[PDB]
Amino acid sequence: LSTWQTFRRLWPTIAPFKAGLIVAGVALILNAASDTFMLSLLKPLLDDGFGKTDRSVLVWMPLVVIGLMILRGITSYVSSYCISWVSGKVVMTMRRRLFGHMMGMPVSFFDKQSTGTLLSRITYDSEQVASSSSGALITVVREGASIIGLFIMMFYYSWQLSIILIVLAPIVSIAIRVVSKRFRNISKNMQNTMGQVTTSAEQMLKGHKEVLIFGGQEVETKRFDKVSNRMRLQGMKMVSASSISDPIIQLIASLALAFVLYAASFPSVMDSLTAGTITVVFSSMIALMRPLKSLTNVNAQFQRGMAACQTLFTILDSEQEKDEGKRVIERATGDVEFRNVTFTYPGRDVPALRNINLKIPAGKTVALVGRSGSGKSTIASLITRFYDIDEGEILMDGHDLREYTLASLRNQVALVSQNVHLFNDTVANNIAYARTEQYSREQIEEAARMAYAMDFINKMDNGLDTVIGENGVLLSGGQRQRIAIARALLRDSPILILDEATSALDTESERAIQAALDELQKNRTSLVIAHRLSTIEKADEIVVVEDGVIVERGTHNDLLEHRGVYAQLHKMQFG
Amino acid sequence: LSTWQTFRRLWPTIAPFKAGLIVAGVALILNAASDTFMLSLLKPLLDDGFGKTDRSVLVWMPLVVIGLMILRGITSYVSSYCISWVSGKVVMTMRRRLFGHMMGMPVSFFDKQSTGTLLSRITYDSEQVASSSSGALITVVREGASIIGLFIMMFYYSWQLSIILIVLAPIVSIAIRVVSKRFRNISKNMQNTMGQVTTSAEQMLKGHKEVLIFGGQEVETKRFDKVSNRMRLQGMKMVSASSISDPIIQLIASLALAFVLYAASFPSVMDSLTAGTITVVFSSMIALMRPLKSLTNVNAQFQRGMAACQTLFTILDSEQEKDEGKRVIERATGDVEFRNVTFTYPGRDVPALRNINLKIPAGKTVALVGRSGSGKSTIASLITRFYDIDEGEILMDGHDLREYTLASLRNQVALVSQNVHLFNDTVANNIAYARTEQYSREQIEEAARMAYAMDFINKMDNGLDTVIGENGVLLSGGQRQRIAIARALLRDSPILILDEATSALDTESERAIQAALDELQKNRTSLVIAHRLSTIEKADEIVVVEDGVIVERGTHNDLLEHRGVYAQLHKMQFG
């Protein structure tokens, strides 16, 4: 099938871990041998232990039992620990490779699927495949060693009784299943024909609204008498047919036992037979009934494990960034132009953007005005090349953006919004998310103080080196905004995108926020999602887009005089 | 608890079948004795069998085994059959009593609870209680006999080793459960502390948008390396605990075994001891572990059975038809009067009918016109006293309904509708639901002929003695109407009510239906649910009822001149 080539693919991963697997295999083999020898211990106990007057063997028995138990315990511990180590290291390397591939492949992938399932793909699926494969391997090795040792012990004690107890058992199972299936078919036919009396009872029970008028209580009661008799007779037949089953199976199994006993009477096997040899041979069959049951199901577990590994490898090599450009930008001038750009959301229809023509010179600022969607978020994403446009051109400093490297393009730009992702790290390291050692602490504190962030950071425990709580436990929305502003100031990025529609206007101390923002985009260009007026009236250019289509252009006064959708949004305060 | 009171209440029902229970008990005791004797058979086989040169016991062993197995099979068959007979007869009598009670119980329950689930408590509930009680009885009897036999056998063979085993087992169980409990607590604590590190990986997988912009893939990889080391170390600890769990239990169990062996080494017990005795005693423990596991769950089964019986009994006793009147009417004159009758549907609110005033003389006919509900169905139910009115008076021939018996009142009235309940019987007997012998076949055929029923009945197999198929397989809607008309014609009811709104007017050969209806209510009073015009224009009186109150009264011409709701319904063809 497809599983074994997958296992061949995993051998390069598990190869440097062969020592642990070998130790675990040896320990498991010794575990199985310990159990088999414990069963083999039964013969001396029943043979020379109690019947004879000697005491040495009976008093020596508990010590060797305890020794075998200590050996079994320590070998189980060693085997499980080494399998644990191999599984853990394989899980480490597979998760690490999967995540390293994950952090470089496009946004659309996790846009499509929920992040909870994406996490489960690495925290459960890898654990699932490791656990299933390790369980299948340990089952095969241990139960195979136990089966081989048990068969060897059985044959060495009495090969004649072993050959009698073999081949006889499969035909006994054949007869048992034949009888069981015949009786199951009989019961199925009985259940199929049982429905008519129930239907008749339901038909009678539904006629109250009609039987009540005509006084047919007596006749209907007689009808129920007959149908109840016919219901009980079929129940009798049902239960009798069901109950014939178990006596037949018991009788056939015990007749097999009687055949074994009768065959043991012949002098062919009685010569080498001893009172202890049968006690170990029959008990060995009793024990051996379980390993085959647990060994015939290994294929299901292994197939499940390899299916999980295949669905993981599907994610492992789906795709990655379309890195094609090879020119780096020291610092973008600031002029960006959209010409006839039309983009469609992958996996959907009804394209959001079409035929946009915009020019943003260096230093100037453009504010986008529109409805809830309005394609503004799509434009903000496309400026930083989260996605790739289908038709149209984006000219940055006179050249196409796609002929440039992704790293330089993303470094030249900054994104500021309330929904900025904090993380479990220190504020000093968080402000400079990358290039931490390329920026001094003095620069960090100066950037924080010019962003009006030192007001709360200083009056907060552990100073500037405090670790941010998980998903802003310690930090607040205004504090998140201040941290993002400080991050923007620290990295001198000419191109900025400023989202404000999702922000709440109920926060206090907004004067500091507006002052910091006013000091922010000096001598640099910023596209602002115009929702707050303070970024609206003083904006150099205001562009109106409805449903992802450009509609209006001009300054605030010109748009207000036009009395278009700009004024209508003015009455509603832009939503 | 309350279960035993219900069992004592049920005991008189089962009492007349004491022979079946006695035979089943004797058979089950013999079954358990057969099993324990088969177990006791081990001692001769392993003591005087293979070891000694004599072979008589070994060759006579298979016949003993076969005989014990034949005895077990036949006694299991007898016990199961007799328990089946007792259960079947108890179910028969209980269902019969419950059903006979139920058809004497008002239609209020029938409308409250669906008839599709009412049979679920005559076919499944009674079967459930009988099966559970019988299973509890056999589980007590057979398993108690088995454990008593096992204890007697063990104490008869070697009571020293028996008391050692029965003293050692409980403390072994105590230690095993203590170890399992503490290790389960450790495992749940490990899960509690594993959640907080599992949630850490998802904290960075959500940062794709933020990671991509600032080029923090290297720092992200380092963070994942750390949180992956922390993941695998905790997985190590988890699996190490889960692996140290089991060997402790195994070691304690086999140390108990070693203690048993070392104690049996002492000369105080070994002197009278032999190999067969230890074999049978240890096998007796092995076999006895199952009954006490299954004998301790009898209370749950008995509680379930008695709860089912409690529900069934609660259905068994409830309110029945209020039989307060004690006067029989030979034949009602026909005059019926409603005065200020207000009735509310039980279990609901918003009374359907209120302040209705109507006078219906003998021979005259009245047709009710209204909307879908309009309370017409309520009036049809109330005239025949399906329910009891709350406030108001109904005077039948100048006398109240409740003053007269329910049986005579329902005998006086006739109900005609499309939804007449056919049933599994012959058409000749169907025409007269009751008093079949009080009406001759000649009268039946004449009534069918004047009801235009011979048109299709004769051209249909087996003639007038045909049995109606299950839920009207043979009969059709028009045929159902014709047979209901014949049923009404055969028994000369002075008062009849017929419904027409639920009827379909698309049927063919309606001329015969209208002719039969015209010939039907000659010289007797009929109340027609006015939906078909042919019963509307020629109606002696027409009464309009809206939302349960009478609004218009008069002839068709007067109502049409009034141009009220009657005319508006006339344009819409009265629905």
Side-chain angles (χ1 to χ4, degrees), chain A residues 316-362:
Chain A
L316 190 150
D317 49 25
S318 189
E319 73 256 18
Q320 219 173 2
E321 273 323 287
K322 313 148 190 64
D323 173 74
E324 301 181 4
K326 285 298 158 58
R327 288 203 288 127
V328 62
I329 298 89
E330 171 46 3
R331 186 172 176 79
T333 77
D335 201 357
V336 288
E337 197 256 342
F338 281 7
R339 41 189 294 166
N340 203 35
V341 292
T342 74
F343 169 75
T344 80
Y345 292 166
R348 296 185 220 165
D349 273 316
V350 192
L353 287 177
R354 56 199 81 160
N355 60 272
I356 297 89
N357 291 322
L358 282 176
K359 184 93 141 163
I360 313 168

Side-chain angles (χ1 to χ4, degrees), chain B residues 91 123-134 301 304-305 308:
Chain B
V91 168
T123 56
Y124 154 80
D125 192 278
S126 281
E127 269 289 349
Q128 180 84 347
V129 55
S131 174
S132 296
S133 199
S134 83
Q301 209 82 20
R304 166 183 305 107

Side-chain angles (χ1 to χ4, degrees), chain A residues 257-288:
Chain A
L257 174 55
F259 173 44
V260 178
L261 286 180
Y262 181 99
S265 294
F266 280 80
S268 63
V269 303
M270 200 206 198
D271 43 8
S272 75
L273 197 77
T274 310
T277 61
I278 294 174
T279 60
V280 66
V281 166
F282 267 125
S283 44
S284 307
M285 211 66 38
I286 291 174
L288 188 148

